[PDB]
Assembly symmetry: C5
Homo-oligomer: 264 residues x 5
């Protein structure tokens, strides 16, 4: 009947509460980061301010999905005979997958803007990145419909998804290393750190996807929710702070005075 | 008893969850686009900033309807004997229909503004477009009261609704192709893309309306909710981003400096 | 036991759903109009910006009442043996009446500001209008406590309430027609349209009040909630848009540049 | 058992609904006033803008307490055998008392600012006022723990609380009448009105506190909720509007141009 | 079974209501402080405005955790046979612990900024403080898993957590006393008060942690929730107001005119 292994298990109070703690914190980090991005946007020059606005998109969108998951978790289970047990609703991770259709494009576009791509190059790269990402996400969603039924199918759609991932990482990595030299304000160093952050954070997702294949039980479910939390904070919030920092440094270097003031 | 076919079926966990995934994503994309429109409104010249404000209306209004539907979906059904089954509330789509009474005017007016219509021509066109749209929507709403009872009646009110649609598309298509030449900043190309986007996205709605007539079952329900989601994101959020992009390009061409800065 | 006739009936799914559709739309139109008023406030000169701020009050206040009513409607009734039937809470319209104590003053004050009244005249007129309005509202609230018990009493308190209405309409109509000539920017025409808008929209409320006296049944309840919806959108949102448009035209005429820019 | 007499009674539908009407209105007046304070803050000179900010604090804080109480009221009681009766939660007023620990300081500080106190005098007066207020509130809270058990104790802690009140009113009244002459823009008249508003509104609270001692029944409960509503609107929102009006008048008198514009 | 002693007891209506009063007040003080920080941020010079933005982070994040706890409290317990008793969900404090992973870094960084640290010194100190804090928090979280089972283990993980605390207090206290002399605008006095505020408020947390070890009963639970409330208001809101006041005084001293105006 069920699609996700979250819905197959009972949880101890400690497991159940840990997962609620993680989901609850995630919601407020995302909404808190939103206010911060709005306040510091005034120090970014207009030619880069879209990059900061794109972080605001991702914060609200991801914040509200987390908020839904956190409510669903407490609604789907009840404490009964010394364990939390499913009750009349089911819990799923598919909320995240569908949401990536909107947020992964935003994360990718904000990188292209601070790399200073422009015009045809900007629009071409953007298109290919967005199709590769939709490719990755849709095939991943279908795959994770088999996580209780058919691990074979999980792995096969996994592999296809991973093909798109690799193409997308290749485009990104190329544009970064080609454009690093033209970065302003000493941000060549910073953008390299961003590339590593992305390689680490983004790879947590396919690991979470494979948990059913290597840790099918309530401890795996705990692991998977922890991986998703770290990956959401790393890939969206911390990445966003680094993109905004790069935007401010380059704004100042280009002579925008609010940015120069913000830096002293 | 029931008015909509959503309320006639039981759903597998996978069908039921897919629909909740779609509804939930829609809510956050609309509220996220809101913040983006507020942040970039400062780069539009005042003569066009109403167009960007009208997008904020549409985002809030549509976002709150989606949020209602998404709550109603989880409230109307419960998982019971390995299927989701209705329980003591009913689910309906009429929330959307009534909401179009407000949002379709806003979408249409924001097009007229960036076409640079003014004065009598602006007010005349706006009036005729709004009456054509209210005509289309009211007749559609009555029609979809027959979707479980009387397909004949569904089709008849459909046909009347479609009459209004065609009138409305005719006015729009005329004003676009007449005014394309006077567009500034090379936006003659972009406005043409907008016209095709509208033709595709707006046409998804009458197709969703006909599903009871050609796929009366839970798979049709899934298809209809998918059609509404794509159509909402295409017709409101992506259309909104294209209107704002055109407004910025024309602002810069007219000599508004914040816009010129935003473009480099 | 019951005070309002809403609580006396069962509703078909179509009646019950139509009412929920109307309530839900009303909440979002009010909160959507709020964002619009904030964005265009920058085009109004400071001497008139209070008028636009007063619309923001009314939008938030009325939006939150509607939101309460919409939640109460779905909480008071459950679908049971093919009809919606009352369950353990009661539904009432008195939420609206008490909220008018705050909002009717705001609507009246925003008219006096754009009529360009000032000083003693402003403060005197404001006082008399606010007491007339409180007079109207309190007597109306008491009256509608008799809508199930005693139509006689309904009608008597009605008549007293209507006395205050007439006085209030008289003051307004006088100040409008006396001050229409001194309006700037060609807004003498516009303010006349506003006066008619008020005569139509405001009169829907006493009609809704009399429904128990001439249509005591679930169809009357449908009619009354539709009257309240149209009256709220007409009397608060569309009236708000007209007052703001008059404020912009007069600002421009007085030489405020943001207003001049906003109008080309 | 119970601490508050709210929890001792059953309520008629009319009594129960009237109280829900009052609580619901209070929430939206406070949130609506918030937007207005943010919009008109731009017309206050920076030297006084803290006063307007402090009203925003009080609006959010009091608005969210009201919102809690309004939800608890509908959650604590159910309609059963033609009356509302308590069910599995309890209703209490202590939410308000604890919230005054934050808001009474804010109300008092915003008065000191527009009286133009500065430096040592400002900080000394603020300290003594805050300790007097915490004294009043804590002793009041303890007192109202005896409203069902021991009226004797109610009255004794009342008397102590009233001692602090008197000290606090004395300090305020002194600083007002000593500083009235130095007020700018003709605000000596206005500040006197503020002092009377405070004397009336603030005194409603001790009267609501004594209702258990002189009207122990559901009609007393209705009276007490009405007194708290009037007192909240008078002491926070209307007082807020008067402090802001005085700040604008003195700003303009000091030569702040946005204020001069706002006044014509 | 249970992880936290909250879940072991029954509560009198007075105990249970006092705790709900504390949690409810906490939520609104944090959201109200948010609006205040946004409004006064315009008086801080851009070189210090990050400090004020960091308070906005902490207010949103902490406000939403409080809001969660406050809802859980009323959801976990029901009034039954004259006491509140647990029902089918469990209450825990771990929500706070996980949230500190985000907020303690923000509180620490906002101090470093107004101490005027810059560059290498800023980034080095920030890193060490954040690792010390994560050290303290993670060990604390594990420790408080033993509060019902094994006080021994509670104390052992306590001791390790306290080690990290001491290191972190040492770094802070050093940087304050080393940098106090270079503070502008007479803020050397103020920063010292901040250091004492932190020593008092921060120490309440380890005391709350030890309550299971010295007051295992419902009165201890009341004490612990009171300690957390005072500690949150002191350590986040009042600390926030002090850091912003120091930012404004130093801005004015550095010649920022908005700040000079804000101070007269
Ligand atoms: C936003 C929510 C509303 C506030 C919540 C509580 C209400 C007010 C609480 C007390 C006052 C707040 C602190 C003042 C703010 C900072 C003042 C400033 O600008 O600079 C500092 C000023 C400036 O100090 P200075 O060194 O410049 O010298 C004084 C200034 N001159 C020279 C001009 C006289 O110093 C102080 O006032 C120190 C403030 C110490 C704060 C101690 C309070 C902590 C303990 C309180 C526990 C209560 C918590 C629980 C209950 C609370 C109710 C919610
Ligand atoms: C889920 C799953 C599966 C997948 C699982 C997992 C964990 C998948 C993880 C995949 C990962 C981590 C992919 C990472 C890919 C990184 C790339 C492509 C990096 C490119 C980097 C470039 C192209 C730099 C280019 C640099 C340039 C051009 C400049 C370089 C030089 O620096 C310079 C020019 C400066 O000299 C399995 C189990 C496998 C199958 C199952 O069936 C399913
Ligand atoms: C639901 C339902 C029904 C409906 C179902 C469905 C799916 C209906 C869908 C209807 C559609 C897709 C309508 C789309 C209409 C597009 C129009 C009018 C486009 C105009 C475009 C202009 C007018 C350009 C004008 C351009 C001008 C004037 C200038 C052009 C040139 O550039 C030049 C400058 C040279 O003139 C049916 C089945 C019917 C009945 C059933 O029973 C129920
Ligand atoms: C509910 C209920 C009841 C009430 C029900 C209902 C539907 C009540 C509806 C009442 C209505 C529609 C009231 C409308 C009142 C309009 C007024 C006062 C208009 C003033 C207009 C001015 C003062 C212009 C002045 C113009 C001036 C001074 C100058 C004009 C010149 O042109 C110039 C330009 C030269 O100055 C009933 C059934 C009665 C009893 C039951 O028992 C209970
Ligand atoms: C609850 C309860 C109890 C109480 C319940 C209730 C309802 C209590 C009500 C208490 C009230 C209303 C207290 C009001 C206090 C007003 C004050 C201090 C006013 C100061 C005013 C100044 C200091 C002006 C000063 C003006 C000056 C210095 C100069 C003016 C000159 O004009 C100028 C300077 C201009 O020349 C009881 C029954 C008592 C016990 C029971 O057991 C429990
Ligand atoms: C929970 C628990 C446990 C813990 C419980 C509890 C309640 C723990 C509480 C711990 C506290 C309050 C620690 C406080 C630490 C303060 C520090 C390091 C302060 C440094 C201050 C500097 C370094 C200033 C330096 C100033 C300098 C260098 C100034 C220099 C000159 O003035 C200059 C010229 C530079 O200006 C126990 C019971 C232990 C175990 C159990 O088993 C579990
Ligand atoms: C993805 C969600 C958000 C998209 C953003 C919407 C734009 C609206 C606001 C514009 C503000 C502005 O100033 O626009 C300007 C910039 C671009 O021009 P420039 O940077 O000045 O280049 C300077 C050089 N020129 C003048 C020659 C151009 O806009 C963008 O980068 C627009 C986004 C383009 C990527 C779109 C990808 C298409 C995907 C197709 C796959 C299905
Ligand atoms: C109903 C919601 C009320 C909210 C209004 C108050 C907010 C104050 C913000 C200041 C903004 C501003 O610009 O203040 C000033 C404005 C305009 O007045 P003015 O410029 O002094 O007039 C011209 C003065 N000459 C002639 C010297 C140039 O004052 C108002 O419009 C005040 C509204 C009147 C209040 C009505 C009181 C009736 C109450 C009776 C109770 C039964
Ligand atoms: C038991 C606890 C008691 C402690 C009470 C503390 C009293 C408050 C101190 C005065 C603050 C004030 O309102 O204003 C603070 C100052 C006013 O300084 P000033 O004197 O005008 O400057 C002139 C200096 N001279 C006299 C030497 C010429 O303005 C500001 O820009 C500060 C901006 C706001 C900072 C945030 C603090 C606000 C907190 C309020 C929430 C309660
Ligand atoms: C905030 C959201 C982000 C950055 C999301 C990233 C998502 C991925 C990189 C997902 C990748 C997947 C694969 C490569 C294979 C397995 C299926 C996916 C979709 C989890
Ligand atoms: C954001 C919402 C939008 C743009 C809605 C568009 C809706 C339509 C164009 C609906 C058209 C209909 C017909 C042409 C026939 C059947 C009834 C309608 C109302 C669905
Ligand atoms: C946004 C709300 C508005 C403009 C409300 C207006 C309300 C009235 C004009 C109500 C009038 C009534 C009578 C004249 C008699 C019957 C009782 C009332 C209160 C419904
Ligand atoms: C918005 C909140 C305000 C202005 C609250 C004011 C509260 C009081 C003046 C409370 C006074 C009391 C006494 C003097 C005695 C009885 C107990 C109190 C606390 C109600
Ligand atoms: C707003 C949050 C703040 C300032 C949190 C502070 C937290 C601590 C100082 C926690 C310290 C702990 C110990 C020193 C030992 C016991 C375990 C902890 C985590 C409670
Ligand atoms: C058993 C009765 C079945 C019918 C239910 C009520 C009919 C409602 C039809 C109303 C017509 C559509 C109006 C839609 C526009 C809303 C205006 C704000
Ligand atoms: C008793 C069973 C509970 C299992 C979970 C305990 C995990 C402890 C790790 C603490 C990590 C806290 C910080 C979260 C990282 C974002
Ligand atoms: C807005 C775009 C939607 C995301 C696309 C997801 C792919 C959909 C394929 C799977 C549909 C599930 C149907 C039920 C499975 C048993
Ligand atoms: C500040 C809001 C007050 C305005 C409300 C009008 C007063 C209504 C009269 C009192 C009737 C309520 C008692 C219920 C008895 C059936
Ligand atoms: C932020 C501190 C809140 C203080 C609120 C008022 C003081 C509390 C009075 C003490 C009585 C508690 C009752 C305990 C249960 C019967
Ligand atoms: C001059 C350098 C300061 C000396 C360091 C003293 C640290 C003592 C910390 C004590 C913790 C309890 C704080 C009490 C709150 C007032
Ligand atoms: C020089 C660029 C090539 C590097 C290839 C990237 C592979 C990264 C694997 C992901 C795990 C590492 C996280 C730090
Ligand atoms: C100079 C004025 C003296 C103040 C006297 C205070 C008495 C307070 C009476 C109670 C307030 C009544 C509300 C209108
Ligand atoms: C604790 C309350 C009493 C404080 C009064 C201090 C002296 C006031 C003189 C202005
Ligand atoms: Cl720029
Ligand atoms: Cl996401
Ligand atoms: Cl313009
Ligand atoms: Cl819509
Ligand atoms: Cl003006
Ligand atoms: Cl209203
Ligand atoms: Cl100033
Ligand atoms: Cl309060
Ligand atoms: Cl600066």
């Amino acid at each position: 009947g069920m699609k996700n292994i979250e819905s197959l298990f009972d949880y101890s109070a400690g497991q159940f509460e840990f997962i609620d703690h993680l989901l609850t914190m995630g919601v407020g980090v995302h909404f808190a980061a939103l206010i911060f991005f709005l306040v510091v946007s005034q120090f970014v020059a207009p030619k880069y301010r879209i990059a900061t606005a794109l972080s605001c998109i991702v914060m609200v969108s991801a914040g509200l999905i987390l908020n839904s998951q956190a409510v669903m978790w407490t609604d789907a289970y009840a404490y009964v005979d010394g364990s939390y047990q499913l009750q009349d609703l089911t819990f799923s991770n598919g909320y995240r997958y569908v949401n990536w259709m909107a947020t992964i494009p935003c994360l990718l576009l904000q990188l292209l803007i601070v790399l200073n791509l422009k015009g045809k190059e900007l629009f071409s790269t953007a298109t290919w990145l967005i199709l590769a990402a939709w490719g990755m996400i849709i095939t991943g969603y279908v795959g994770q419909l088999y996580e209780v039924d058919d691990i074979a199918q999980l792995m096969i759609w996994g592999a296809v998804s991973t093909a798109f991932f690799v193409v997308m990482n290749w485009i990104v990595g190329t544009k970064i290393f080609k454009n690093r030299a033209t970065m302003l304000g000493g941000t060549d160093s910073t953008i390299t750190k961003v590339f590593w952050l992305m390689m680490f954070a983004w790879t947590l997702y396919p690991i979470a996807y494979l948990v059913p294949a290597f840790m099918n039980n309530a401890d795996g479910v705990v692991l998977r929710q922890l991986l998703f939390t770290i990956a959401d904070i790393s890939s969206k919030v911390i990445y966003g702070l680094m993109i905004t920092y790069i935007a401010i440094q380059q704004s100042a270097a280009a002579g925008y005075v609010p940015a120069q003031q913000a830096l002293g």
